[PDB]
């Protein structure tokens, strides 16, 4: 029951500020780049498909990674090890039964040992100070969906798609809180499917007017438009599945009417 929905929403809005990554961090990494991060994330999407992991598990892993890379320098050869330990941790946090560690070693094709992954897990825990219950775009979406009239499952699939697209590109997406990105994804998916718009229920609840969403929306629309050309294609291929009503086949709108 919706007894706690206001309370949880408010608390998630508090926590997302506290669980925010450093926006300008990739420029202080001497060895890694937005483009490598993009490859790592796209690979994590496939790992999650491979092991049938929940979508929340991927968003959590990417939040752990960005918070980690916010304070720890990492050589390109160790980036995938940070990614693997994050996905393991997120699976333990969020999955019913997470894959075994051996499975995580198997998925890098044995490029690290089980010990290395395990020690990296401990390091990730220490750096994150065991704070793993991070609000994600996927969580703000789920809450937002309660406000559909009526619920439309293409709208739901499509907003998830878009919210996942944003995990891939540090620039620009690390500028926005999950609640804002979720706001843009939801509007853009609604608009795409039906022509409808960020509903007034949510304007009041979130305090986000459609105008305030504008910068994030502009970016997300451009991402949506260019997705079929993007270097990384994992999320598109995922959201062609009938599970997802093939929403990632749908034609994006060429203008937003803003």
């Amino acid at each position: 029951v919706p007894d706690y929905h206001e309370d949880i929403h408010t608390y998630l809005r508090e926590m997302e500020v506290k669980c925010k990554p450093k926006v300008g961090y990739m420029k202080k990494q001497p060895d890694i780049t937005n483009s490598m991060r993009a490859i790592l994330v796209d690979w994590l999407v496939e790992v999650g498909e491979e092991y049938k992991l929940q979508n929340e598990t991927l968003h959590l892993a990417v939040n752990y990674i960005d918070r980690f890379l916010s304070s720890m320098s990492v050589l390109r050869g160790k980036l995938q090890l940070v990614g693997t330990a994050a996905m393991l941790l997120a699976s333990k946090f969020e999955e019913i039964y997470p894959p075994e560690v051996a499975e995580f070693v198997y998925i890098t094709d044995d490029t690290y040992t089980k010990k290395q992954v395990l020690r990296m897990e401990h390091l990730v825990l220490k750096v994150l100070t065991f704070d793993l219950a991070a609000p994600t775009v996927n969580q703000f979406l789920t809450q937002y969906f309660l406000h559909q009239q009526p619920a439309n499952c293409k709208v739901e699939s499509l907003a998830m798609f878009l919210g996942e697209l944003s995990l891939i590109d540090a620039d620009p997406y690390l500028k926005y809180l999950p609640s804002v990105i979720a706001g843009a994804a939801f509007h853009l998916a609604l608009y795409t499917v039906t022509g409808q718009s960020w509903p007034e229920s949510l304007i009041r609840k979130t305090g986000y007017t459609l105008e305030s969403l504008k910068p994030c929306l502009m970016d997300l629309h451009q991402t949506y438009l260019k997705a079929p050309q993007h270097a990384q294609q994992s999320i598109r291929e995922k959201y062609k599945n009938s599970k997802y009503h093939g929403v990632s086949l749908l034609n994006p709108p060429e203008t937003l009417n803003l």
């Binding site: 997470p98 560690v101 089980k114 897990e121 065991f130």
Partner: peptide
């Protein structure tokens, strides 16, 4: 520190 690492019960209890 060779088979499983930090157990999910401890990950949840601590973080929550």
């Amino acid at each position: 520190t060779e088979t499983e690492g930090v157990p999910s019960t401890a990950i949840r209890e601590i973080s929550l």
